[PDB]
C-alpha cells in the first residue's frame, strides 16, 4: 500500500489561484492550496496520471483546517488504463469536517485485481449547493510494483482475447463459413465451450435423438435457472350443520405445516379473537375433505389451548414437534411459564409431553412468536428468537438446538448484539428457514424491540459458522416465509399482501405480486403450491377469518419445458441452407441452458 | 497541543470481553480491542479520567479496519472536573467508515478556556439501531501544562465567586439586612449594578428621581429592552390613483414623508408613470404619465432604484427586457438620475457597461450611502441577446465623481473575501455600521440561505451564516434606529425580524401575492406595501396598505415608567414598596447594565 506519485494530466476547468496542481500539496493551513472548478456543473472532471500503471486501492482526501462549503458532498471516481476506457470505482461523499478521509476504490472485478493509469475525479455536488467544487489534496495509495501489476494486466488482456475468440467462433458457427475455423480455434485449445453444448453441436452436424440429451438436462436441473428467470389463486371449498362443523373454525395465529410425502396438512391451536383453541385438524391435498383429529387435545394428554406458538414436522420420521405458548400477566405464573415441549406421532396418533420444561434441561425458555426448524438429515430442532416470557429490559432467546436422537438441549449461540466475528442477534417476528440443500439456517425480518430489523444472514448447522448476507425485501407488520430447496429460493408473503422471491445463488430480491394478518402459510416444493389459511382481517377491534387460499407458482415445470422442446423439434421434423435453418431450433433450445455454460449472447453483426 | 494521558474511571455497562480498557489502545486489526455497551438503552455511557486536570480541545475516535454496524451513528460528549456535574461539549455522529476521525469539543465560553478532568462519552444511536453501542479507541488532545490550565481554573473560580457574591449582595439589598453590606463589594471592588444604576438606587432609597431615569432612557440604553418586547391598515387615496402593476419600484422619503412610485408591468404592457404620494395629505399625486417625455427612462418593469434624502434624487439602473426584444443595441445598461427637487430627469449613462459599470441586469439590488454619497449595486443576472447564466458581482458608482468601480467580482469559490452573486436576494445598507447586509437570494434555480455582511470602508467580508428558507418574493429593509432587519415573504403573509446586536431571527405575525413592493420607515415607523400580483396571468393586486409593527416604543415605555412612578408616589402619600418598584423598573435596563437576575432565596 505504498504511496503512488501522480501528475495532473488534464483539468476540465480551474479558477484563479486554484490551479489543479495544488492537490499535490497537503497544506490544510492554506485555503489557496486547493483546486477549484470554474463553475458548478456536470462537466467538471479532473484527470490525474500516474507515473506508472498501478492497482490503486485507496484514495485519501484532505480538507481545510475548518469546514468549507466547497467540500465535495457527492463525487465519483473512475479508473482506466486509457483516458477513454473509464470505469467507475467509488461514488461516495466527503465529509464537511477537516478529517483526512480515505476511501477504498473498487480495484477487484470477479475477485481479480485490475490496474489503472488515469484516475478521473468528477465532483457531483458540493456541500454548498451553489458553490464550486474544490479539492485540497489527493493521495493515491496502491500496489505500484511491476511484478504485481504486469501479471494482472496480462491476465486481463488474455481474458479479452479469449472473449473475442469465443465471439468469433460463435459467429463462424452461426454462419458456418468453414469448419476449418474450429481447427484454427483448436490450436490454442482455449475456445472450446462446455462439452454439454458440444454434444448438442455435434448432434446438429441425430435430429430426434437430441431429446435424450435434453432428458439429461432435466435430470441435472440445468434449466432450473431459466425456470427461475420466468401465479394462480384458488379459494378451496371444503368437500361435503356441516357448513362449519366439517372444517376448522375461524382462528388467528395458529400453526400448521404441510406433509410433502403424505401430501397432507395439519392445523393445531389458534385464536378466534374470543377464546384460545386447542383443536387439532388434518386436511388432504388429494381432496377438499377436512377431518378433525380431535376437538380438544388437552384431554388427550396433549398441548392445551395456545396461540402464537410454533410447530414443525419431520417427513422422514413423520414426527410433529411443538413448542411455545403466548400468555398474559394475569395467566403467567411460576408453573405457567414453563417451556413445555411436545412430540406427536401421526402414524400412531399419540400425544405425549416430550419435556415439561426445556429451560430445566438447559433448553430455551418459554418464548412466543419464535421460530423453529427441524433438520431433515440429523433431525435437529433448531429454535431461534422469540421474546422470553416472564412475570424490565426485553430478553430474546438465542439460537438453541435440540437432539431428537438423544433428547438433549444445547445453546448454539446467545443474543449477542455486539456484532462479533460470529454473532447472531435474537429477534421476534422474524422468518427463519433451514435450506437443507445448502444446509444453511437462513433468517431475516424480525423486530428487535420494535426496531423493525432488516438484517439477513445464513448460519451453517454443521460448520457452526454464521455468514452475514445483508447488514432485502419490503418489511411488513407480519411476514411469513417458505423454502424451496429444489429451486433454492425463499418465498415471503407480507401481512397487513406483497409477495417476494429471490434466488440463493444470485442473491437478488424481486417482487412477483385477500388481506390477512397473523395468518399461516405452508409450502410444498414438489407440488409447487403454497397454502394460506387463517389470519386476522384487521369494523370492530376484534374479528376472525377462515381463509382457504392456495397459490400456484407461475414458473414452468421441467416437464413442461421438455414437452415444449419436443414439440419444437417435431415441428421441424414434420417438414423434413437447410442446415442453417435447422440450426435455429438448436440455437433457441440452447437459450434454455444456464448462461454460465452457454456460448456468448452477442453477435458480431450486432456489435459492428 | 499534545496527547493527554487518561484512565478509565466508570462504565455504565460492558458486554463480554469487550472491557472498557480496550479503548486505551488503538488496534483496528483486532475487533475485540474495543468497548461495547451491554445494551442500547438511555443509561449507557462511559467516563474517562485524565492523569491531571487539563484543557481538552479535540477528541480523536478510532475505527475498525472495515465498516462496522456498532459504530456510533450519534453520540454526545460531556466535560467536567467533578463527575457529579458535567457540561456538554460535542454532539455529532461517527461515520460508518474505517478512517480515524477527530472532533473539536466545545471548550470555550466567550474567549475563555474551560479545563476538564472527567470526560463522559454517551452514545445515543448506532448505525444498526438493534445493535448496541461500541467504541473502539479514543484519544484526548489539548493543553495539559499547568502554566495554562491553572490560570484558567483560577479565573473560573474567581468568576464563580464573583457571581456568588453578586447574588448574596443582591439578596442583602433586597432584604436590607445591613447597611454595611457594601463593604463586601469593596472587598471585590465590583458593584452588582452599573454606576448609573447604583446612583438611581441610592437616590430612590419621586419628582426628581424620575428625571434620573428619564435621562438614561433618552440616552438610548433601553433599545435592547424595547426590542425584547400586526397592525395592517389598508389605506385608500383621497381618478387620481394608480393602476394594477407588478414588478414596479417604490421608495420612501421619511424626512419629506412621502413615497415615490415608478414603473411596473400591468400584464398588458409596461408602465412609465411616476407618482408621488404624500402620507400627510393622503393624496396619490401624479408627477408624470411618461418619464421619457421629461428626459426620463422608458416604460419597463423589474428594475431597482434608491432615494437620497439629503439630495432628493433618485438613481435608477437595470431593467428587464423580453428575450424576443433582446438585442445588443437594446440591452445597454441604462442608468438614469432624477431630481425630484426640480422634477427633471437626466441620463447618467446610456450604457454603464462601457463606462465600467455592471451590464444590464434584472432582479438586482441597490443601496445608497449619503455619508460618502456612494451607491452600491449587487446581484442581478446579466441579460444577453439570444450558456451558463452569469451573475454580476458587487459594484460601486461615484455619485459625485461619476465613475464606476468594482469592489468584489462574482466569486463562487468561497474565498476568504469572496461574495457570491445572486438574484432575488435582499441587500441593505446599515449606515450606523457603514456596511451592507446581504441575505437570501437565488442562484441558477438554487435557493441561497446564506447571510453575510461586507464593510464598505474596511472592505472586509464577514460570513454570518452558511429561519426563513425558500422564501420567494422576500422584501426586507433595515432600521438602524432599532437596528433590526424586517423581512416580508410571499408565495412563489409570513413576516420575520432580525436583531443584529444579538444576531437573532424572530418570528412576528406568522395578503397573498408576489413580486410586490415594500418600503420601510424608521422615523414614523410607517411601512407601505404596494403592488404584487397573486389564477390568471392578468390578475394583479395594487391595493395600498400602511403596514405597522404592534410593539411598545421608547416614548411609550418612558410614559409607562412615568405613570408607574406617579402611582407609586401617590401610594406613598415598611418601605419595601419603593425597593420593589425600583426592582421592577430595573427590568427595563439591559442585561449587561442590570443586576444579576433572581434572588438568593430562589436557590436556597
From Swiss-Prot, chain A:
SMART domains, sorted: LisH
Record GO cellular component, one term: postsynaptic endosome membrane
InterPro entries on file: Beta-prop_ATRN-MKLN-like, CTLH_C, CTLH_complex_component, Gal_Oxase/kelch_b-propeller, Galactose-bd-like_sf, Kelch-typ_b-propeller, LisH, Muskelin_N
Subcellular location(s) of the protein: Cytoplasm; Cytoplasm, Cytosol; Nucleus, Nucleoplasm; Cell projection, Ruffle
Principal subcellular localization: cytoplasm
Keyword Nucleus: yes
Biological processes annotated in GO: actin cytoskeleton organization; cell-matrix adhesion; neurotransmitter receptor transport postsynaptic membrane to endosome; regulation of cell shape; regulation of receptor internalization; signal transduction; vesicle-mediated transport in synapse
Record domain LisH: where: 160-192
Domain CTLH, residue spans: 194-240
The keyword Cytoplasm appears for this protein: yes
Residue windows of the Kelch repeats: 264-310, 319-371, 388-429, 440-478, 529-576
PROSITE patterns in alphabetical order: CTLH, LISH
The protein's assembly and partners: Homodimer; may form higher oligomers. Identified in the CTLH complex that contains GID4, RANBP9 and/or RANBP10, MKLN1, MAEA, RMND5A (or alternatively its paralog RMND5B), GID8, ARMC8, WDR26 and YPEL5. Within this complex, MAEA, RMND5A (or alternatively its paralog RMND5B), GID8, WDR26, and RANBP9 and/or RANBP10 form the catalytic core, while GID4, MKLN1, ARMC8 and YPEL5 have ancillary roles. Interacts with RANBP9. Part of a complex consisting of RANBP9, MKLN1 and GID8. Interacts with GABRA1. Interacts with the C-terminal tail of PTGER3.
Protein's name in the database: Muskelin
Species this chain originates from: Homo sapiens
Name of the coding gene: MKLN1
Amino acid at each position: 500500500c505504498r504511496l503512488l506519485p501522480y501528475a495532473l494530466h488534464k483539468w476540465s476547468s480551474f479558477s484563479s489561484t486554484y490551479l489543479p496542481e495544488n492537490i499535490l500539496v497537503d497544506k490544510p493551513n492554506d485555503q489557496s492550496s486547493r483546486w477549484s472548478s470554474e463553475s458548478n456543473y456536470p462537466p467538471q472532471y479532473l484527470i490525474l496520471k500516474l507515473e506508472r500503471p498501478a492497482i490503486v486501492q485507496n484514495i485519501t482526501f484532505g480538507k481545510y483546517e475548518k469546514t468549507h462549503v466547497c467540500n465535495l458532498k457527492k463525487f465519483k471516481v473512475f479508473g482506466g488504463m486509457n483516458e477513454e476506457n473509464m470505469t467507475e470505482l467509488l461514488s461516495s461523499g466527503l465529509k464537511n469536517d477537516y478529517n483526512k478521509e480515505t476511501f477504498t476504490l473498487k480495484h477487484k472485478i470477479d475477485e481479480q485485481m485490475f490496474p489503472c493509469r488515469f484516475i478521473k475525479i468528477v465532483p457531483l455536488l458540493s456541500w454548498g449547493p451553489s458553490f464550486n467544487f474544490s479539492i485540497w489534496y489527493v493521495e493515491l495509495s496502491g500496489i505500484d510494483d511491476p511484478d504485481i501489476v504486469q501479471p494482472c494486466l496480462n491476465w486481463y488482456s488474455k481474458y479479452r482475447e479469449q472473449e473475442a475468440i469465443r465471439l468469433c467462433l460463435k459467429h463462424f458457427r452461426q454462419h458456418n463459413y468453414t469448419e476449418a475455423f474450429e481447427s484454427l480455434q483448436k490450436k490454442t485449445k482455449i475456445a472450446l465451450e462446455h462439452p454439454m453444448l458440444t454434444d448438442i453441436h455435434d448432434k446438429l452436424v441425430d435430429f430426434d435423438a437430441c431429446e435424450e440429451l435434453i432428458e439429461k438436462a432435466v435430470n441435472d436441473g440445468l434449466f432450473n435457472q431459466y425456470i427461475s428467470q420466468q401465479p394462480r389463486w384458488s379459494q378451496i371449498i371444503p368437500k361435503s350443520g356441516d357448513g362449519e362443523d366439517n372444517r376448522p373454525g375461524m382462528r388467528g395465529g395458529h400453526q400448521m405445516v404441510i406433509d410433502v410425502q403424505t401430501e397432507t396438512v395439519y392445523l393445531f391451536g389458534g385464536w378466534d379473537g374470543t377464546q384460545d383453541l386447542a383443536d387439532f385438524w388434518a386436511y388432504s391435498v388429494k381432496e377438499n375433505q377436512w377431518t378433525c383429529i380431535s376437538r380438544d387435545t388437552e384431554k388427550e394428554n396433549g398441548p392445551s389451548a395456545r396461540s402464537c406458538h410454533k410447530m414443525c414436522i419431520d417427513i422422514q420420521r413423520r414426527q410433529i414437534y411443538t413448542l411455545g405458548r403466548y400468555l398474559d400477566s394475569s395467566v403467567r405464573n411460576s408453573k405457567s411459564l414453563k417451556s413445555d415441549f411436545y412430540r406427536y406421532d401421526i402414524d400412531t396418533n399419540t400425544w405425549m409431553l416430550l419435556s415439561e420444561d426445556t429451560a430445566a434441561d438447559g433448553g430455551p425458555k418459554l418464548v412466543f412468536d419464535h421460530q423453529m426448524c427441524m433438520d431433515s438429515e440429523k433431525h435437529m430442532i433448531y429454535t431461534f428468537g422469540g421474546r422470553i416470557l416472564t412475570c424490565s429490559e426485553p430478553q430474546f432467546s438465542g439460537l438453541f438446538a435440540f437432539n431428537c436422537q438423544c433428547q438433549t438441549w444445547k445453546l448454539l449461540r446467545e443474543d449477542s448484539c455486539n456484532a462479533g466475528p460470529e454473532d447472531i442477534q435474537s429477534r421476534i417476528g422474524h422468518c427463519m428457514l433451514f435450506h437443507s440443500k445448502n444446509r444453511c439456517l437462513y433468517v431475516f425480518g424480525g423486530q428487535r424491540s420494535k426496531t423493525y430489523l432488516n438484517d439477513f444472514f445464513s448460519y451453517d448447522v454443521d460448520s457452526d459458522h454464521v455468514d452475514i448476507i445483508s447488514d432485502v425485501p419490503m418489511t411488513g407488520f407480519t411476514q411469513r416465509a417458505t423454502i424451496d430447496p429444489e429451486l433454492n429460493e425463499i418465498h415471503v408473503l407480507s401481512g397487513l399482501n406483497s409477495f417476494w422471491i429471490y434466488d440463493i445463488v444470485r442473491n437478488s430480491w424481486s417482487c412477483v405480486y385477500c388481506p390477512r394478518f397473523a395468518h399461516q402459510l405452508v409450502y410444498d416444493e414438489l407440488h409447487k403450491v403454497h397454502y394460506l389459511f387463517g389470519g386476522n382481517p384487521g369494523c370492530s377491534p376484534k374479528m376472525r377469518l377462515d381463509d382457504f387460499w392456495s397459490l400456484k407458482l407461475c414458473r414452468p415445470s421441467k416437464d413442461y419445458l421438455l414437452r415444449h422442446c419436443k414439440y419444437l423439434i417435431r415441428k421441424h421434423r414434420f417438414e423434413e441452407h437447410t442446415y442453417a435453418q435447422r440450426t435455429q431450433l438448436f440455437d433457441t433450445l440452447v437459450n434454455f441452458f444456464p448462461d454460465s455454460m452457454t456460448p456468448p449472447k452477442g453477435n458480431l453483426v450486432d456489435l459492428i
